Enzyme design. Sequence first.
Site, PDB file in Angstrom:
ATOM      1  N   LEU A   1      93.397  30.868  20.783  1.00 31.52           N
ATOM      2  CA  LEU A   1      93.485  30.205  22.084  1.00 31.52           C
ATOM      3  C   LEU A   1      93.293  28.693  21.950  1.00 31.52           C
ATOM      4  O   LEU A   1      94.173  27.993  21.445  1.00 31.52           O
ATOM      5  CB  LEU A   1      92.472  30.800  23.074  1.00 31.52           C
ATOM      6  CG  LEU A   1      91.074  31.253  22.630  1.00 31.52           C
ATOM      7  CD1 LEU A   1      90.705  30.826  21.218  1.00 31.52           C
ATOM      8  CD2 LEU A   1      90.020  30.788  23.621  1.00 31.52           C
ATOM      9  N   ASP A   2      92.160  28.196  22.443  1.00 35.98           N
ATOM     10  CA  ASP A   2      91.819  26.788  22.339  1.00 35.98           C
ATOM     11  C   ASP A   2      91.232  26.673  20.952  1.00 35.98           C
ATOM     12  O   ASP A   2      91.964  26.531  19.970  1.00 35.98           O
ATOM     13  CB  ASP A   2      90.774  26.407  23.381  1.00 35.98           C
ATOM     14  CG  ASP A   2      90.928  24.986  23.858  1.00 35.98           C
ATOM     15  OD1 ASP A   2      92.020  24.413  23.664  1.00 35.98           O
ATOM     16  OD2 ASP A   2      89.960  24.441  24.427  1.00 35.98           O
ATOM     17  N   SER A   3      89.912  26.728  20.837  1.00 33.00           N
ATOM     18  CA  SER A   3      89.400  26.704  19.479  1.00 33.00           C
ATOM     19  C   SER A   3      90.080  27.805  18.670  1.00 33.00           C
ATOM     20  O   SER A   3      90.777  28.663  19.214  1.00 33.00           O
ATOM     21  CB  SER A   3      87.881  26.867  19.470  1.00 33.00           C
ATOM     22  OG  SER A   3      87.498  28.157  19.914  1.00 33.00           O
ATOM     23  N   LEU A   4      89.930  27.737  17.342  1.00 32.03           N
ATOM     24  CA  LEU A   4      90.381  28.737  16.369  1.00 32.03           C
ATOM     25  C   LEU A   4      91.893  28.962  16.330  1.00 32.03           C
ATOM     26  O   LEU A   4      92.365  29.878  15.651  1.00 32.03           O
ATOM     27  CB  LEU A   4      89.671  30.077  16.588  1.00 32.03           C
ATOM     28  N   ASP A   5      92.655  28.162  17.066  1.00 32.19           N
ATOM     29  CA  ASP A   5      94.091  28.030  16.888  1.00 32.19           C
ATOM     30  C   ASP A   5      94.483  26.579  16.687  1.00 32.19           C
ATOM     31  O   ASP A   5      95.670  26.246  16.751  1.00 32.19           O
ATOM     32  CB  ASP A   5      94.841  28.617  18.085  1.00 32.19           C
TER      33      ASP A   5
END
Lengths: 107, 141, 165, 86, 57, 458, 173, 51, 114
Positions: free
Chosen positions: D40-44
């Site tokens: 999503l936001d973080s971790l992509d």
Amino acid sequence: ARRYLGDASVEPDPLRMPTFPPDYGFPERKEREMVATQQEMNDAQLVLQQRDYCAHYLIRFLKCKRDSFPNFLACKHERHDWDYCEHLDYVKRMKEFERERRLLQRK
Amino acid sequence: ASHITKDMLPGPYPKTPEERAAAAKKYNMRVEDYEPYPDDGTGYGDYPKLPDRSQQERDPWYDWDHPDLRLNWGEPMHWDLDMYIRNRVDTSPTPVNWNLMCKHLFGFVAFMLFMFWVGETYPAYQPVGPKQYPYNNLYLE
Amino acid sequence: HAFFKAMLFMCSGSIIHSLNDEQDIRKMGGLFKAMPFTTTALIVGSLALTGMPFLTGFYSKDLIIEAANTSYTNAWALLMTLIATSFTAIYSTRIIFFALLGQPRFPTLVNINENNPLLINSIKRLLIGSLFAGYIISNNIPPTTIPQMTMPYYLKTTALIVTIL
Amino acid sequence: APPLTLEGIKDRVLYVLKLYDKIDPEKLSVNSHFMKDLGLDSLDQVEIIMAMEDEFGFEIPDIDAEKLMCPQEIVDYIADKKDVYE
Amino acid sequence: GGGAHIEPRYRQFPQLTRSQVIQAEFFSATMWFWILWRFWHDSDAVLGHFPYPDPSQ
Amino acid sequence: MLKYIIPTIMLMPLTWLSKNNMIWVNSTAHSLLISFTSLLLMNQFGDNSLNFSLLFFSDSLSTPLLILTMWLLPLMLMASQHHLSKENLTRKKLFITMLISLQLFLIMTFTAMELILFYILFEATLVPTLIIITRWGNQTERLNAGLYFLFYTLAGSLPLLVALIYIQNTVGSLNFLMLQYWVQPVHNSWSNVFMWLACMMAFMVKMPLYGLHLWLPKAHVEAPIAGSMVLAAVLLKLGGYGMLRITLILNPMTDFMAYPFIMLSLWGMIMTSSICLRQTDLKSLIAYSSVSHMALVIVAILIQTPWSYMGATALMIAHGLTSSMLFCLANSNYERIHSRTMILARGLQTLLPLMATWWLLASLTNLALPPTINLIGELFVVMSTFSWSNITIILMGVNMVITALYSLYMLIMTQRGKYTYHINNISPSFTRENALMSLHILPLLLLTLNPKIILGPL
Amino acid sequence: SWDKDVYPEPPRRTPAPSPQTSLPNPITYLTKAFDLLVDRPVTLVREFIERQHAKNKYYYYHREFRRVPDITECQEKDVLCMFEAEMQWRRDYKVDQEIVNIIQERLKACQQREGESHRQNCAKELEQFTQVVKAYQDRYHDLGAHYSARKCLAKQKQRMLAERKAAKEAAAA
Amino acid sequence: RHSIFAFTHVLIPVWIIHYYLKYHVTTKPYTIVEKKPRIFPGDTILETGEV
Amino acid sequence: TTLDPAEYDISSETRKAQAERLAIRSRLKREYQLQYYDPSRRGVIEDPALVRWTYARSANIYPNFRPNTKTSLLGALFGIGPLVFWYYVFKTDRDRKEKLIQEGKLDRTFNISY
């Protein structure tokens, strides 16, 4: 254990001794024990802490180091015999606290 | 050769908004935490009104610094605050003071009480009576 | 001692160039990732640094810790010298357990190379000179002092077991 | 002493797409833009180069995040940093 | 570069030059032959000992 | 001097007598030729003594010190031509003639045969130096510094005349140092304090104490074209040596009040070198090095009894060659970057590789690396004032510590990079820039082979 | 060269032989080869100069000075006779430096020649040298008037204190 | 060769440095300051014997 | 230990209109880069942040200075301060050292130097 006192000559570096300075000496059994020749001990270029006992056996021991020059061992068994000269000397000295613990007790 | 705003004057309350910046842009509009009020301790001739001292400090460490030259190598335009101690001084560590280093040598300071004794190998302790008797007993026989 | 680390810096100097830089005890792997020769040279000097079972400086190391046997020392000195010998053993297997033991973990493009005879002429002279150093020097030397040669029961040979633990 | 060309950087970036189990070998080659299936936001945004954090991983500063949306824009300035192709 | 005699890898284990292992295995044999004078013949402490000199009277 | 003054005055109607731009090559040609003749009759023997000719020379017998005074006019003309060549030839003929006119009086000084011939020649300078300070500098603070150079030197030197004329009509006449066989001693009184003090204090104003050094980073900071009288002003400071001529005799037994000159100049030594590590002007960095290990001789003269005169003489011409060259290192590398700010000259050591050796072999003489003329000088001073009191190894040892961290701080500021600026700084240290930077270390390490030439009586 | 009484040493007394074994000794390989390789370019060239230098000779003489006046001359306001008494005196102090240099090298002679014992033997040096240096700084070293070297203005007056204070004021010697 | 490279390096100064050595022990009143023989028994160039 | 050094704090929304302090330094950098790039310069830029750094440190301390405080009269604890103490030591030696040198002896026979 030897000595006598009043060194005639004023030569320091304790070669001015009774005859030969031991570590303690003699003291009891034997109350006397002798040494090598001081005129040879100065003729042999040898440092102090080497004029103790088993020196004459060592003065003949290390002579074969040059008398057998390209050698690996002049006499390895005599090194075990000079140690046997040394170990018999040292266990003779080890009987201090066998006595001093008991001889300082009451009687 | 620049004569207008050559350096400071006897401040630091000579209408401080006129100083930074006529030139010497230490503050933007005299509220920047570096308005030239900081004469810390008047009576010393050091640091007058002075687009200068007690500003935030301890070390331009020249890290990533990607705007441009930024830090210490590459020379930005007007950022000199106090120097000659800051081309060799850095930032904060992990923990804090807990001065265990003097406590590290304190272990031998307790073992200075072991400097009072001796280290004779033969025999062991035997520390309760006078049977030990460090030196010899009687004479010849 | 002079034959130890000029070998050993130069021994590990082939490794830093081999990954082209890390010089970290992390991110290394095991011993044999086409590294036959220098890992064999690592396990000699790091075995010498254990405390000399029969190696080079056995005639320097053992004869001094058993020259502090009978002494008028601090009695906290032998409680500081002989304890340090045990700490010298975990020096050995640490570089074994991170650079010479584990699974190969490091970033890729394995660009290793070891076959320059300038280095092979270097190590092969010093490793031979390492082993037979003291057995020529101490075998052919004038003795100047009277040795100890006494070491009784439960007090004598634990300095090896100091290194074994 | 080892040189490098530009045909190797096109493969390793493309391979770690296939090494991730979140992404199939059915996305586009050079420009899927991450948002196509990025989430999503973080971790992509930082995890998408956390595999190359171990492999290439030359400390990859704070500017490298939002440029990396365009998956060709990753390939652009790696050649600028490590003194690469002509 | 000029000569690619040792190729780079993708973790496929590039091997040795099939002569380095000979010199490698030769210098494990020269040290474990050199355990000869460690045991045969050298003991722990060739000095002789004292048999507890208590009877000194 | 039979005739050393007589050829070197004949240099003067040669310069204006010449043609156009030949005036540089005509002066430097003949000025080197005296260096044979200067050596020639001098350095003779040698055991009590060489009175030379007459009332004009005692030949500078046991303190040579004078060959170094004659290098410099063929050392400064090659140095001064960097930024001088924009003025008129009528003033370019002037600046060579007053420079020779400074060497004329120094030649009859250091020898001087007397003590009253000394003073009138001790004060015969300071007029041609002041002309080089006020005219031919840079932007202002020349003019106050032209007045700080006076009024310390001249306020102190006038109570010499009150005391030297007082001796001339008290005990015979001072006219010879060899009529100083009859010397009455000088006891403890309330008038004999001032006779000692006024005769001494005019020498302290040139070789400074920690107090009254306030003129020394004024004239050297704001300074002529390329160190052109700054090389002269470092000789002139050590040309106040005459305390060696006076105080050896002529009140010999007053050590009773040496102590406010010892402690002021022994604690000041450990501080006035420490106060320079935060300098930002490069020519003021060297100007405090010249304070510190010059003031080591002041505790080496007042403490008598040689093994110090072995070293106190060798230290006068230790940094006679060192501190000259350091000014020449800074008179260069200012022609290219027009600031003396030490911050600005970074990005170096790549651009000018050949002069990297000239930085180090300068700064390796303050670290002083014992086979030079330097640690044969300090280690006689150290082994002298050890025998005064043992505690003086501490302050003088920390003197050795801080100047190690001090000299390298001037080296290591050039070992950086990327240079950020500077479309200028192209000139790759031309043939003149290395020639006048040479002839400094070439005699400096040469004399370390047989330095029996550099010794007192002793 | 010199004379051996100034620079003494005992004989050589160098042992020899002692082989006793058929073990391979490299000493026969060493001295029996390399001595000849140096014998040609040294002995032939040194002899070649030795005749070439004996082609002509050059002379330099002993330089002995004249000692008519000695010490207590002369009257106070004189200059001339009190110049000669300093020219007398300074030569009697540069020389007396170097006699301490000779006796010190004599101490260097024994100790590298014996080395091992070095203390109880040679019997002479530590007795001779410390009866010369203890005879040095008294009356011949202006301690601490050594700075001006004070020829006859202070060289007599340590020795005035060695007469006006010594030998009468000991109460009662 | 290994002929003119090796002979020029070492063989020439040993001719030089020996010449300032044999012509030097008889000039300076102290040469090399050699120690004694360190003998046990007694023979060598003397005659004295020992038990 | 010198110092804390305060590497994280709070914001949002204490004085949110504080922005465009970068507009000062972007103005300087747009002034600098336009100054730094040119085809014929051959020489440094003035950059008077250095000029105000030396001239406000070299001069402009004594025209500033008034002795109105006692923290500038503190220097008698620092200037003449330790110089008092070094005199106290050096006359206890060379006097206690002197009496032992005359009354009685301490040095040996082989002390020619000195």
